[PDB]
Protein backbone atom coordinates (compact mmCIF):
# COMPACT_ATOMS: atom_id res chain seq x y z
CA UNK A 1 0.00 0.00 0.00
CA UNK A 2 3.04 2.33 0.10
CA UNK A 3 4.39 3.84 -3.11
CA UNK A 4 7.82 4.10 -1.44
CA UNK A 5 10.04 1.61 0.37
CA UNK A 6 10.24 3.69 3.56
CA UNK A 7 8.96 1.45 6.38
CA UNK A 8 6.08 2.65 8.58
CA UNK A 9 6.79 3.65 12.16
CA UNK A 10 6.51 1.17 15.02
CA UNK A 11 3.82 3.19 16.82
CA UNK A 12 1.49 2.28 13.94
CA UNK A 13 2.65 -1.32 13.53
CA UNK A 14 2.27 -2.34 17.18
CA UNK A 15 -1.43 -1.33 17.54
CA UNK A 16 -2.16 -3.23 14.32
CA UNK A 17 -0.18 -6.23 15.59
CA UNK A 18 -1.80 -6.10 19.04
CA UNK A 19 -5.33 -6.44 17.66
CA UNK A 20 -4.28 -9.45 15.57
CA UNK A 21 -2.53 -11.09 18.55
CA UNK A 22 -5.60 -10.51 20.79
CA UNK A 23 -2.94 -9.17 23.17
CA UNK A 24 -1.07 -5.88 23.48
CA UNK A 25 2.43 -5.96 21.97
CA UNK A 26 4.96 -3.41 23.21
CA UNK A 27 8.35 -2.12 22.08
CA UNK A 28 10.31 -4.57 24.23
CA UNK A 29 8.64 -7.53 22.49
CA UNK A 30 10.32 -6.65 19.18
CA UNK A 31 13.78 -6.92 20.74
CA UNK A 32 12.98 -10.54 21.63
CA UNK A 33 12.50 -11.39 17.95
CA UNK A 34 15.69 -9.55 16.98
CA UNK A 35 17.75 -11.54 19.50
CA UNK A 36 16.71 -14.89 18.01
CA UNK A 37 17.43 -13.91 14.39
CA UNK A 38 19.60 -10.83 13.84
CA UNK A 39 18.85 -10.51 10.11
CA UNK A 40 15.07 -10.82 10.54
CA UNK A 41 14.24 -7.15 9.99
CA UNK A 42 15.85 -3.80 9.28
CA UNK A 43 15.84 -1.71 12.45
CA UNK A 44 16.87 1.73 11.20
CA UNK A 45 15.44 4.57 13.28
CA UNK A 46 13.30 7.25 11.65
CA UNK A 47 14.49 10.85 11.93
CA UNK A 48 11.14 11.68 13.58
CA UNK A 49 12.26 9.69 16.63
CA UNK A 50 10.03 6.68 15.90
CA UNK A 51 11.28 3.12 15.61
CA UNK A 52 10.78 1.34 12.28
CA UNK A 53 11.05 -2.22 11.01
CA UNK A 54 11.00 -3.60 7.48
CA UNK A 55 11.60 -6.75 5.46
Amino acid sequence: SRSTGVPPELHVLLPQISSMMKRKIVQDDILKLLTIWSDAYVVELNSRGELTMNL
Partner: protein, 157 residues
Protein backbone atom coordinates in the same frame (compact mmCIF):
# COMPACT_ATOMS: atom_id res chain seq x y z
CA UNK B 1 2.22 -22.92 -9.06
CA UNK B 2 1.94 -20.86 -5.87
CA UNK B 3 5.44 -19.47 -6.41
CA UNK B 4 4.50 -18.65 -10.01
CA UNK B 5 1.73 -16.39 -8.70
CA UNK B 6 4.39 -14.25 -7.01
CA UNK B 7 6.21 -13.64 -10.31
CA UNK B 8 4.11 -10.84 -11.81
CA UNK B 9 4.81 -8.97 -15.05
CA UNK B 10 1.68 -6.78 -14.95
CA UNK B 11 -0.40 -4.81 -12.48
CA UNK B 12 -1.91 -6.47 -9.42
CA UNK B 13 -5.41 -6.63 -10.88
CA UNK B 14 -4.15 -7.48 -14.38
CA UNK B 15 -2.31 -10.61 -13.22
CA UNK B 16 -5.30 -11.90 -11.24
CA UNK B 17 -7.71 -11.56 -14.17
CA UNK B 18 -5.60 -14.03 -16.16
CA UNK B 19 -7.55 -17.32 -16.36
CA UNK B 20 -4.50 -19.44 -15.49
CA UNK B 21 -3.61 -17.32 -12.45
CA UNK B 22 -7.27 -17.19 -11.39
CA UNK B 23 -7.51 -20.98 -11.52
CA UNK B 24 -4.10 -21.27 -9.83
CA UNK B 25 -5.14 -19.32 -6.74
CA UNK B 26 -8.61 -20.90 -6.90
CA UNK B 27 -6.92 -24.24 -6.27
CA UNK B 28 -4.70 -22.58 -3.65
CA UNK B 29 -7.76 -21.16 -1.88
CA UNK B 30 -9.48 -24.55 -2.20
CA UNK B 31 -6.52 -26.31 -0.58
CA UNK B 32 -6.37 -23.99 2.44
CA UNK B 33 -10.07 -24.06 3.36
CA UNK B 34 -9.74 -27.69 4.48
CA UNK B 35 -6.01 -27.82 5.34
CA UNK B 36 -4.89 -25.77 8.34
CA UNK B 37 -3.17 -26.31 11.69
CA UNK B 38 -3.42 -24.46 15.01
CA UNK B 39 -1.44 -26.88 17.20
CA UNK B 40 -4.06 -27.93 19.75
CA UNK B 41 -6.83 -26.35 17.66
CA UNK B 42 -5.66 -28.07 14.46
CA UNK B 43 -7.84 -27.37 11.40
CA UNK B 44 -10.15 -24.77 12.92
CA UNK B 45 -11.61 -23.97 9.49
CA UNK B 46 -12.76 -27.57 9.21
CA UNK B 47 -14.97 -26.94 12.22
CA UNK B 48 -15.88 -23.50 10.84
CA UNK B 49 -17.12 -25.06 7.59
CA UNK B 50 -18.77 -27.82 9.63
CA UNK B 51 -20.88 -25.45 11.72
CA UNK B 52 -21.58 -23.19 8.72
CA UNK B 53 -22.94 -26.07 6.65
CA UNK B 54 -24.85 -27.15 9.74
CA UNK B 55 -26.60 -23.77 9.83
CA UNK B 56 -26.82 -23.45 6.01
CA UNK B 57 -25.50 -19.93 6.59
CA UNK B 58 -24.83 -17.72 3.58
CA UNK B 59 -22.26 -15.72 5.59
CA UNK B 60 -18.90 -17.29 4.74
CA UNK B 61 -16.72 -15.96 7.54
CA UNK B 62 -12.92 -16.12 7.42
CA UNK B 63 -10.16 -14.78 9.65
CA UNK B 64 -7.66 -12.64 7.76
CA UNK B 65 -4.41 -13.64 9.47
CA UNK B 66 -4.89 -17.40 9.08
CA UNK B 67 -4.98 -17.18 5.28
CA UNK B 68 -1.72 -15.19 5.23
CA UNK B 69 0.14 -17.98 7.08
CA UNK B 70 -0.64 -21.04 4.95
CA UNK B 71 -0.85 -18.97 1.75
CA UNK B 72 1.46 -15.96 2.03
CA UNK B 73 0.71 -14.05 -1.18
CA UNK B 74 -2.87 -15.32 -1.52
CA UNK B 75 -4.06 -13.14 1.37
CA UNK B 76 -2.13 -10.08 0.18
CA UNK B 77 -3.71 -10.33 -3.28
CA UNK B 78 -7.09 -10.42 -1.52
CA UNK B 79 -6.23 -7.13 0.19
CA UNK B 80 -5.00 -5.21 -2.87
CA UNK B 81 -7.78 -6.30 -5.26
CA UNK B 82 -10.69 -7.39 -3.04
CA UNK B 83 -13.30 -7.27 -5.80
CA UNK B 84 -11.38 -9.50 -8.20
CA UNK B 85 -10.23 -11.92 -5.49
CA UNK B 86 -13.58 -12.30 -3.73
CA UNK B 87 -15.25 -12.85 -7.11
CA UNK B 88 -13.58 -16.25 -7.48
CA UNK B 89 -13.44 -16.85 -3.72
CA UNK B 90 -17.23 -17.00 -4.04
CA UNK B 91 -16.86 -20.08 -6.25
CA UNK B 92 -13.96 -21.58 -4.30
CA UNK B 93 -15.85 -21.37 -1.00
CA UNK B 94 -18.85 -22.92 -2.76
CA UNK B 95 -16.81 -25.85 -4.06
CA UNK B 96 -14.70 -26.24 -0.90
CA UNK B 97 -17.75 -26.38 1.38
CA UNK B 98 -19.46 -28.71 -1.08
CA UNK B 99 -16.55 -31.06 -0.38
CA UNK B 100 -17.96 -31.21 3.16
CA UNK B 101 -21.59 -30.31 2.30
CA UNK B 102 -22.42 -31.30 -1.28
CA UNK B 103 -25.65 -30.24 -2.99
CA UNK B 104 -25.33 -26.85 -1.30
CA UNK B 105 -26.01 -25.16 -4.65
CA UNK B 106 -29.38 -26.95 -4.69
CA UNK B 107 -30.74 -24.30 -2.30
CA UNK B 108 -28.29 -21.35 -2.34
CA UNK B 109 -26.89 -19.90 -5.56
CA UNK B 110 -23.96 -17.83 -4.24
CA UNK B 111 -21.61 -17.68 -1.25
CA UNK B 112 -20.65 -14.09 -0.43
CA UNK B 113 -17.43 -14.09 1.60
CA UNK B 114 -17.31 -12.20 4.91
CA UNK B 115 -13.78 -11.18 5.87
CA UNK B 116 -13.09 -10.70 9.57
CA UNK B 117 -10.39 -9.23 11.81
CA UNK B 118 -8.76 -7.23 9.01
CA UNK B 119 -5.81 -5.51 10.72
CA UNK B 120 -5.46 -2.17 8.94
CA UNK B 121 -7.86 0.49 10.23
CA UNK B 122 -8.68 3.89 8.71
CA UNK B 123 -10.70 6.83 9.98
CA UNK B 124 -13.12 8.87 7.88
CA UNK B 125 -10.47 11.61 7.58
CA UNK B 126 -7.68 9.27 6.42
CA UNK B 127 -9.27 7.90 3.21
CA UNK B 128 -6.54 8.94 0.79
CA UNK B 129 -6.87 8.62 -2.98
CA UNK B 130 -4.45 5.68 -2.92
CA UNK B 131 -7.01 3.73 -0.86
CA UNK B 132 -9.48 3.67 -3.77
CA UNK B 133 -10.41 0.21 -5.08
CA UNK B 134 -8.95 -1.39 -1.94
CA UNK B 135 -10.23 -3.14 1.16
CA UNK B 136 -10.51 -0.73 4.09
CA UNK B 137 -11.71 -0.92 7.69
CA UNK B 138 -13.30 2.13 9.32
CA UNK B 139 -15.21 2.89 12.51
CA UNK B 140 -17.99 5.39 13.07
CA UNK B 141 -21.55 6.06 14.19
CA UNK B 142 -24.77 5.08 12.41
CA UNK B 143 -26.57 8.36 11.72
CA UNK B 144 -28.81 7.63 8.70
CA UNK B 145 -30.23 4.22 7.81
CA UNK B 146 -32.48 3.23 4.91
CA UNK B 147 -35.05 0.46 4.62
CA UNK B 148 -34.71 -3.01 3.13
CA UNK B 149 -35.61 -3.42 -0.55
CA UNK B 150 -34.64 -6.01 -3.17
CA UNK B 151 -32.01 -5.23 -5.79
CA UNK B 152 -31.39 -6.61 -9.28
CA UNK B 153 -33.40 -10.24 -6.48
CA UNK B 154 -31.42 -9.75 -3.26
CA UNK B 155 -31.78 -7.39 -0.32
CA UNK B 156 -30.24 -3.91 -0.36
CA UNK B 157 -29.73 -1.19 2.25
Amino acid sequence: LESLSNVKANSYSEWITQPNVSRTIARELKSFLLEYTDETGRSVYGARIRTLGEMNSESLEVNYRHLAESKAILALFLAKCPEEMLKIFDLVAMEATELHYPDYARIHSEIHVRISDFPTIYSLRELRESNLSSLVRVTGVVTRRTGVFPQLYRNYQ
